[PDB]
Structure formats: C-alpha cells, structure tokens
C-alpha cells in the first residue's frame, strides 16, 4: 500500500524509463562558478537633453563586463489617464549600439513596441508596461520615473556580456534619440500641450566585476560572441479600400542568417496603433458612446486583440522567386506563429514569421540566410476597408476578409528581421565578423 | 600624451565585402556545393577566413 | 562597489566558487544541423461538415513533421456570449494512425481538459483567441479558427515524426467533427436555422533537413519515446440534495502513466465542469430577474468557483490498496496542478500526478498500470442542496455542499497520459506495446 | 518551399551549423531511478486554534521528503472584500528543526513578500485561490486553504530532504498560528462574534526509492546546498507629512546572500505595504462617499500604485563603502524584479539581488555577509503631503511624495536569503556554517 | 499624412565617380520641386490667378528648398550604410559645396 505499491509495479515497459538508470531527481549537484559581483552604475549623458534631442553615452570602464542597461526617464502627464500609451517607450525613439566605432545594432521605439508585443508576456509584460506608462489611472501633472531596459543581445543574457576588459582600446557607446513628441505627455493627437515639461534622462549600466583568474583570461584571450542584430526598413503600405483588396510585393533588403521576420502595420500619427479605430469599447477615443470618434484612439487602450480591425488579410514570403510557404491568413502570422514559436499572445496588427524553431531563445534554432537571397519578397494582401467603424453592428458583426474604413489610416509598414552575427574581440579591439 | 593604441573604425575584423566572399570560398577550396562542405570541414573552413596584422615600430 | 563583494571572500564562498567549474558570462552555443521549416496544406478526404468524419494522409513533402494546425472557418449563430471555444468543440476528436496502426487519439473534451490543466497565462489566452470569439463579435461574424493538435509529435521538435524513415508506411489523421457546436449551429438544444457548414483545412509543419541528417534518418532505425492518451467515458454517480453519492471506478488503464486527469460535466454544454448559479458569469442572465440556472452563460462557461464543483474527495487505490490518503476534490483541482504544472486549473477539473513534472517530455516517475491488477478511482461527491438561484446560498455556503444544479453534471471523463515507444525500422513502424 | 532556405547557405552559417553538434529533431531521454511519491498526513501535536502554537513531527513513511502543504479550514467572518490571503495571515510562522538544530524559519509576512516577488502569472493566481476567497464569497463561507511551505526542500526534488539518511534525527515543523485573521475572526481591531476556530492538517509528500537509490542515500554522506531565510524586524523611520524621513540599519546578516528583500507595512493589516487612499481599491469604500482612508479594502490590500509606497530611494553600504549608487524606490520595486525574476512586484515591496538569477536554485552570485562588519541598508522616505481623501491629490501628484496615511506604515521587515550546507552523514544531519 | 519611404535597388555597374538624382513632375520639364503661390514658384504666383497646378515655366527651377521633396537619404552597399543618413538638403547644398 501507499507509494510502495507503485514502486514495485515494475515490468518490461519500464525498462526504457528506469532500467540502467542514468539520472536522479533527488540529488542536485550545483556547479561551482567563478566568483563575480554585479553593480548598477550611472553613466554620463552627452548632448542637450529634452524632447527631440539626440544624446549619447560612452560606457566607462568601471567593471569588466556589461549586461543589462536601463534608461531612466522622468515624465509628467500632459493630460489625464487614458491619454498615454507606453510614453517612455515612445520617447526613446531609437538607440544605436556602437562598439569600436562601428554599428553593431540599432533599436527603434516601434521595435520596442513590436518586440514587446511578440516576445514579452504575462506579468513580465505587465511589469514592463508599469515601467514605461501610467497604469494606475494617474491624472494630469502626475510625475513618474520610467525605466526602459535596452534590448540588445547583451542586455538579455549575461552569456553575451560585453567584455569591456577585452576591449581595452575600443569604446562602447550608445546613441539615444528622443522623440520630438510623446502622446499624452507633450502632444495630444496633432496638438501640442502647452506647458509640457521636458523629460529628465539617466542611463544605468549593470557591470560585472570578475575575480582575478577570470579577468586575466578575458583580457588575454580572443573571443567570438554570437550576437543578435536587428535589421529594419520602413515601407509604404499599399492602401486598401472599401472597393478592393490591395496587394503588394515588398522587397526585403535583408542580409545575414535571420531567426525571424516580424512586422506590423500602423498609423504613425498614434504610437502603437496597429489596428483600425472603431466605436466599440476600447477601440477609439470615447468608444461605446455618442461622443466616440474614429479619428483618434483610446490611447491607454491603443493595443487590441480584435483581429477584425487588423488590416492584413494574408501573406507569403518569396525567396529568389520561389514561394517559401503557401499563402496564409494574417491571423496565422498573428496567432499561430507566436503560439508555436513564442508561447505568448500577440496583439492584432502585429505579425511574426519564424525561420527558427524557437526565435524567442538565444540558441540558434534555424535561420534563413538572406545574404544568399538576391530577391526576398514579402507578398501581402489587405482586407477590404468597407466597415463603418462608427457602427458596432458593422464592426463586430462582419466577415473574415473585411475590415474598418478606418483601416486605411494604417499606411505605414514596419518590417523587421532579427539575425545573427559574430562579435570578434582580440587584443583590446573588436567588431563584427561580417559587415 | 593620451594612450589609445587602436584606430576605432571597425576595419580590422570586419568582413566588409560583398557576397562574393562565399563565391571566393567556393573557388578557394574546391567543391562548388557549400551546403555540405562547411558542414564537414568546420575548423578547416574557419581558419581560412581570419586576420593578419602588420605591426608598427612606434 | 561590487569590488567589495568580490574581495571579502571567505570559507562559505568555497562551496559556491572554489575550484569553479563554470561561468555565466560567456555562452558557447551549440552548432546545430542545417534545416528549414514549412507549413504545407494537406488534402482532406471525405466531406467536411457538422457531424462528419473526414481524414487526411500526411504528404511526404519534407523529412520530419511536428506542429499540425487544423483550420476552420466558423460563423456566429448568435451574439457574443453564445459560444465557448467552438472550434475546439467542433473538432470532436482526432485519431493518429501509422501504417494502419492506432498510435493515439484526442477528444474535444480532452483538448478542453488539457488546456484547463497544462496551458497558462497568455499561452492560454492566445490559445482561446485561436478557438473562440473573444472581442465581443456579433451574430453573422466570420472567423478563422486554428486548432493546434496535441499528439506527441506536435509538442516538441525532439519527437518530430520521421516520415523520411517510414518509406513503406502511410501516416493518417482521422478527424471527427461535432454534430453541433454551441453558438455556431445550435443554441442549447435548438438548431440555428441558416447555420453555415464549417470550412476546413489541415496544415502540417514539415522540416526540411540537409543531406547528412536526411541520410541518417532515412537509413537508421529509430525509437521515439512518445506520449499516448487513454480515455474512457463513464456515468457519474450523480450527487443529490439528499445524499453524498460515491463511486468506485475500476481504471482500465495500461502502460507507465505520468498522470490521470478527469472532470465531471454537463453532457449537453461543452466545457461545463461546474454547476450553474445565479452569480455573475455562472448562468445565463445571472444577476438579474431573467436569470436561469438551467442554461450557462456560454461565453463564461469556465469558472474557478469551486462551490459549483462536485467532487468532495477522492483517492486512487492500486490492487485494492490506498495509493495515497483520501484528499478533497479541491486538492486535485488546486494543489496537484500547483505542484506538477504551475498553472491554474478551472473548477470541476482534476489532476493526479504519478510524476514530478508531467507537463514536460522527460519521464519523471510513472505508474505502470500494466503491472497493477486492480487500480480504482474512488470518488465521494458533494451534496447538491444549494438553491442555485440565490447568491446568499451559493456564495456563502460550506465546503461539503454544492448547487442543486450540480446534478446536471452527469458525465465523467477519465483520462490517463502514458508513455510508449514508437519504433521505426527499415521504412516501417508501429508501437512496442499494445497494453 | 523549405528547400529554398536550405540552399541559402554560406560562410556566415558556419558558426551556426558547421560541424554540427546537435539537432533538435531527436531527443535522448535519460533513464532515471525508480521511485514513487505519496501524500501522507502528519499528526499535529499540541492544540490547533487561533494564537496557539502547534508542532508536527515528520513520520518515517518514505525515504525523502519534498513538498509540504498545510491545510487550514476557515469560515468568513464577513462578506467578500473583507479578507486578504487569510490562510497566509494565519500561518504566523513555521520553524524547521533537524536533529534539534534550527535550520530555517518562515513568517506570514515572508510568505506574502516571497509571493509578491517570486510567484507570478497563473502560479500566483492559483496560489491565491489556495489561501483566500476569490469568487466573491459571502459571510459564513467555508473553505479549505492549502498553504505550501517554501523551505529549500519544499521547492525542488533536487534538495529533497533524505529522511532515510537521517535515521537518528527528527525533522520537525513548529507552527505559530496567528491570534487573529482578518475577515475571519477579526475585522480590523474588532472581534467577530461567532467566528469558528481553524481546522488544521499538515501534509508531507514523501518519495519512495527503490533499493539501489535508497541504499545510497542511507549509507553515503551528503552535502545539500540549500537556501535559508534570515529575518529581523525593525521600527520604521516613520514617514512624515513635513519632511523626508531617513534611516540607516545595520543588518545582522550572515552567509553568502543571494538577495535582500524588504517592505514597509502597517502591522495592523496583513499585507498592507502601501498607504490608504480614496482612489479605487486603495481603501475600504474608495472612490465613494463611504470611503475611509483609515481601513484598506482588504480584498484589494495589495496594489501596483507606487504613489502610495513610501520609499523614495535606497542603497546598501558595506564597511563604509557604497555597494551601488543610490537608486529610487521604484528601481527596487520594478527594475530589480524585471531583471532578476521576470514577475511583477506590488508597491511597497522591494528587492535587491546580488545574484544574476535569485529566483533559481543554482548559485549565480552572492554577497557573503559573514565577511562584512557593517552591512547597512540606507533608506530615504517620501514626504507624506498628499491628502489621501482626495483622489485628485493622489493621482495627479509628484515622484517624491505620498499619502498622509502613509505614516501608518510603521513596521519594517528586512529579509535576506542565503546559501548554506546541510551535511548529512551516518544517519545524522546539521549545518556546516552558523 | 505620413513620411513615405522607398528602397531602390541600384542596378549600376562600373567604378562610379558619383550618383545624382532628382525628383520631378513628368508633365513639366525641369520641375524638381513642388509648386507654390510664392514668387516664381507657380503660374500666376502672387496674384488672384495663381495656380499651383502649373509652374512659372520661365522660373521652373528654384533654390527654395521648402518645396523640395526628399527629407533624407542614405546609400547602402550590401545592406551596409555607406555613410550616415543625411538630410536631402545635405545632398542638395553641401555635397556640391
């Protein structure tokens, strides 16, 4: 009786599970590790700081290796709750990573939004929003410090920590562009907010201090760190209409082994708007009532999972004239791809196509080398823009191939590609193996 | 004065060439099918594409 | 700074960093094989429609297969709140066959149970988005629904089925479509006039391997450790206001079993594992004059309100002897999942693991039922004395009782998930054990 | 199709796929030992009731033990919204004793702090379902709660305590039950007439090993690298509406510490780490005429609204030298957890890690306080200038201020988690370091 | 409503000294800028009869950059920026300076 009655229920079908046992679960031996310590250290920001300014920092040699980097900002609300959407993310327009005088990588505010939409999830995603927005129904004038972690490869895993110690003669710099305008902070739709305050910025770098045996090896040995890079181009979106399903062949100017492509359609007017506006709760400013307008989003609820408001009907990727895969619906890219490849939930209007089994991890799991592809093309088909966005009967009650008339406002297309490269470091200098 | 022993222009370890480099690899080793050749000779292919330094007396 | 931590090294640091074995700041990634992945459409034999049985043979386009997604196009036969995971309900079951031999079989209820136990957070939500309407869509709305399959090779690349190594055997999927789907072609027991038949398509994700790996798979014998689902439906010893019903179910299971899972349900309401009640979300019209406790709020069928669950307690005996002490139904609903999975299980759904971590693929303890002469699941039911139409009685009651409407949960579904071995040899295969 | 990608290969791929080492398409599973797991009830010694001390001895039914769940049955003393994780409040503390030696000890507040920092998503939600009423239950509702313990052996099988290797030593759990539990037998300071006393049961999940594995555990010496909790209570440099309170606490901590954690609280209300306010969820009746900023909405005691937190900034100083530059309270509340855990921490709860991944089992950097003379936690508080009864005053205000009701958070709880070694030999165990 | 973008593969060969380009209105020879009701920028500019559909042909070309279309540009070789992105005015005034 008890657990022993299971233990002795042993036969031939158990041999491949427990015969000639190799492991146990009840004796974990932890690996001894090199001694190290971690410290968060403030960097100096060069350049005038405020909206529309470009500033930069040079990472000092306080420690040996660097990993996580957080940009702090202090922003004040230019309107009430519901008027902002990830404004600290919007504020940091872009970040460029330069090592040894060469570009290693570059991120954009939209990428941060797209990245988050695809790869963060659950409470990590919520905590992230708490670090970039006002999520407790704050009012005009409220002041908060925001944190925007960077998403460069070395900011994601200690495994890729940049060996400042092995880069003795090369500097590591970050160039940050601040947006000229941030919704609900210094602008409201197209209007400026009189009296809006300028942001305060601070950049913090988490350094690793190694013990002497480890420090010696890094300083002396050559290293090759497998890193990730983001490639990005903006494109015109063929504009759909009430009378037609627009289609488009977009040339993809990408290179290197690519883990995945990602993209979204958006309305540049409103940061984070990847879907059409509508008079259904959360889908537009004042949605659900008489005062609703489908010219402006409910900014605090800009993101949505309501597929019906997404513009893309279907798509395929062609490589050198050969179809990569059969044309699939936008909903495939929006829900299936990330179900299988990430495990989180992707907002409507945001799409993913992986060439990898696990694009969300660091370990390579299949790549598409676009340097061997003369003509990579993303072929898109858009939905018919015939739904009266101001009428839920038409918005919520409709067909697969038809979207909002307001979906024609989503005229910008952002296509991203995340790839691998190698960061070679030797004798205090380094750079990427492949341009 | 100031001690900076590098140039800082990413011109040492960068393979900033076109995609004629893999074509040079094909004409450099043998075997125009490089979908199974780097899969076989890994170290022999890696050491064939590395740096060369021409020092200064200072 | 961090340096003071590195320097103050003592005796207690020896067991953490003395004679160090690893570092964390330099990850060497393993080089993997050259492969590519593609989603390829299959041809379905037979006519797709409600209540029909159809099947497909998986095309030999790539070398290995993993993920499989069944696409459906459904329309709403009523307004939001009338459907509940309708694409999951529609796919009544799927049977996997190799060389004419059954390998496995899943049921719509299993998909619901599986989801209830093993998916979580935004994975669960994203899944719901792929099988239901979750943005308050209205009658006449059309949507494409993706139902990923949950066969052993649909969960990890590690079990990719080597179609390449099955040169002499066909691989088929048999799909049974439900005669009715709530809120799509029927509303409770009433047919919806004019309801559309579903459109259906099956997509299989193939892996294209390079030369060396294809060769090995095609020529070498293989043994893939796989999971299988065993299932029998039973009549429930339905509880009553007048008594604590009890039941002893001889468990006709075999093979090393990772876990058992079960639920009690309403035979006519998909996904209803709990009693109906006049509390918000627990019944059609709950909270108002029109509330009825004979029909659910279909869109809100699932709940965590255990009061409406019916299992008071249970134990599993092996060869007539207790395997563990009798525990409350709430143990099997809340704790077992906490310990073994880490997600949240809906009321009315229960889990008992024989494994440390059944949610994974690696064996972590099994119960071999092929060596247990008399395994029995012994159930004690709650007393159905609560007047379901009165929140005072429903929300304020004791541990041992449930709703009078809990007597409608007359179906019991008992599942077991086990291991077996799929052998592929000289182009053909099948399973090592029948039972 | 897919072939078009395979052919797209050249020099840039060699670093990823040349001389391949692994595949993803064939998994080798590792044959494991033969074992079984049984849930067995322990006998509780002493007398179960509110405010009583009870204990239990773990019976030698199996060979190893891991998970421990303490069941409690409580009845609501009021309506929905009057309780907050009451089973957690009830288990005031638990002490782990092996061979007569104190190995570890948890407190109700630690269970709350721990949860706030390390559980997440549906683990956290399912976790609340086991310790509270979360389906709008009404007065008189009866529920069995399951409070898992969080000692090192209760989190991973890797550290299952080998009772088999401890033939000479008892393993005991000493429990203190709270004198009062909110919304169960008391409502703020008021007693609830008619409230029931708790029913308690302790369940231990025991692993049964087969002969070869059991023999090795029984006969071989072992060194289990385990984690322990250190905890001291302090008086808070109570916040004021007129200025910024400050405090410097020498921490009586030892051992390689993976992290420090702390909170400020109102000892009156379990889990209250923030100020009360007339904003939705921030006080009983918040948002309406009946709102009182003297009593929390118990069911919503915890919040993510940092405006109601009291820490402005903090640093840790070691032997007179700064360990890191002073950072804002929101760093410790939002960034640390982002970087080190991946969950979302409630306002008023702070974390500072010395470890890359403090949430895991494997050591990933520690601060050894056994070699630090003066480990001091420096805390700067916000000015409590906000009139808590006016939601505009709260919701529209600045970074350096908080609610006037924040001055009620007079207790300070500072925790530290470290590594030690539980040595087991010749049928006995004990710790390598004190 | 939006800043348009375009990526034009350059099908060029040989050791190029320089690239040059312009944007124009195919209808009107030499029109490389937008038309406007400012002196010289359109037919009838400055008066009631002014139209911005037809240029002042004798003054078709102008130095008034506001009417220029290009915001910014870069040239890439194998996806690598050949130089940092510069404003259209950089390519109009500085390069030739």
UniProtKB/Swiss-Prot annotation, chain A:
SUPFAM superfamilies: Group II dsDNA viruses VP (SSF49749)
The protein's name in its UniProt record: Major capsid protein
Primary role: Major capsid protein self-assembles to form an icosahedral capsid with a pseudo T=169 symmetry, about 190 nm in diameter, and consisting of 1680 major capsid proteins trimers. The capsid consists in 5040 copies of the major capsid protein (hexamers), 60 copies of the penton protein (pentamers) and 1800 minor capsid proteins of different types. The minor capsid proteins form a hexagonal network below the outer capsid shell, stabilizing the capsid by binding neighboring capsomers together.
A Pfam family of this chain: Capsid_NCLDV
Note: The viral capsid possesses up to five major capsid protein variants. They behave as asymmetric capsid components.
Induction info: Expressed in the late phase of the viral replicative cycle.
Family label: Belongs to the NCLDV major capsid protein family.
Major localisation: virion
Superkingdom of origin: Viruses
Organism: Paramecium bursaria Chlorella virus 1 (PBCV-1)
Compartments where found: Virion
Swiss-Prot record, chain B:
Cellular location(s): Virion
Domain of life: Viruses
Stimuli inducing this protein: Expressed in the late phase of the viral replicative cycle.
Cysteine-cysteine disulfides: none
Its job: One of the minor capsid proteins that constitute a network internal to the major capsid proteins and outside the lipid membrane. The minor capsid proteins glue and stabilize the capsomers.
Quaternary structure annotation from Swiss-Prot or TrEMBL: Interacts with the major capsid protein.
Name of this chain's protein: Minor capsid protein P4
Lineage: Viruses, Varidnaviria, Bamfordvirae, Nucleocytoviricota, Megaviricetes
Span of the entire protein shown here: 5 to 62 of 181
């Amino acid at each position: 009786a008890g657990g022993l009655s299971q233990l002795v229920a042993y036969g031939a079908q158990d041999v491949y599970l427990t015969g000639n046992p190799q492991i146990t679960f009840f004796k974990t031996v932890y690996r001894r590790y090199t001694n190290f310590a971690i410290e968060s250290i403030q960097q100096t920001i060069n350049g005038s700081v405020g909206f529309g300014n470009k500033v930069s920092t040079q990472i000092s040699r306080n420690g040996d290796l660097i990993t996580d980097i957080v940009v702090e900002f202090v922003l004040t609300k230019g309107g009430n709750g519901g008027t902002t959407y990830y404004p600290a993310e919007e504020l940091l327009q872009d970040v460029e990573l330069e090592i040894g005088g060469q570009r290693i990588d570059k991120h954009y505010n939209d990428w941060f939004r797209t990245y988050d939409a695809l790869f963060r999830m659950n409470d990590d995603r919520y905590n992230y929003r708490r670090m970039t927005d006002w999520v407790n129904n704050e009012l005009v004038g409220a002041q908060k410090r925001f944190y925007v972690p960077l998403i460069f490869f070395f900011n994601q895993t200690p495994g890729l920590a940049l060996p400042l110690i092995a880069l003795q003669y090369h500097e590591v710099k970050l160039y940050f562009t601040l947006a000229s305008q941030v919704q609900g902070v210094n602008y409201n739709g197209s209007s400026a907010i009189a009296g809006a305050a300028q942001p305060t910025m601070s950049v913090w770098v988490d350094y690793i201090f190694l013990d002497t045996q480890e420090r010696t090896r890094f300083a002396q040995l050559p290293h090759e760190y497998l890193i990730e890079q983001l490639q990005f181009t903006g494109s015109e979106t063929a504009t759909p209409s009430a009378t037609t399903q627009a289609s488009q062949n977009i040339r993809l100017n990408f290179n290197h082994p690519t883990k995945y492509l990602a993209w979204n359609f958006n309305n540049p007017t409103n940061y984070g708007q990847y879907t059409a506006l509508a008079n259904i709760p959360g889908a537009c400013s004042g949605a659900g009532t008489a005062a609703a307008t489908v010219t402006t989003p409910d900014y605090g609820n800009t993101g949505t999972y309501n597929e019906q408001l997404a513009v893309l009907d279907s798509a395929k990727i062609q490589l050198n004239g050969q179809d990569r895969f059969a044309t699939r619906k936008g909903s495939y890219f929006n829900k299936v791809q990330p179900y299988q490849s990430i495990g989180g939930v992707t907002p409507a209007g945001v799409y993913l196509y992986s060439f990898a089994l696990k694009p969300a991890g660091r370990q390579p799991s299949g790549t598409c080398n676009f340097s061997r592809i003369d003509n990579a093309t993303l072929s898109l088909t858009y939905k018919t823009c015939s739904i009266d966005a101001t009428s839920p009967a038409a918005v919520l009650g409709n067909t697969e191939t038809v979207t909002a008339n307001t979906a024609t406002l989503l005229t910008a297309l952002n296509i991203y590609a995340k790839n691998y490269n190698v960061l070679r470091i030797m004798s205090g200098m380094g750079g990427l193996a492949y341009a | 004065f100031r001690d900076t022993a590098s140039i800082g222009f990413s011109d040492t370890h960068q393979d900033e060439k076109t995609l004629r480099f893999l074509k040079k690899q094909i004409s450099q080793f043998i075997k125009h099918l490089k979908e199974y050749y780097p899969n076989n000779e890994l170290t022999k292919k890696l050491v064939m594409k590395y740096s060369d330094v021409q020092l200064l007396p200072y």
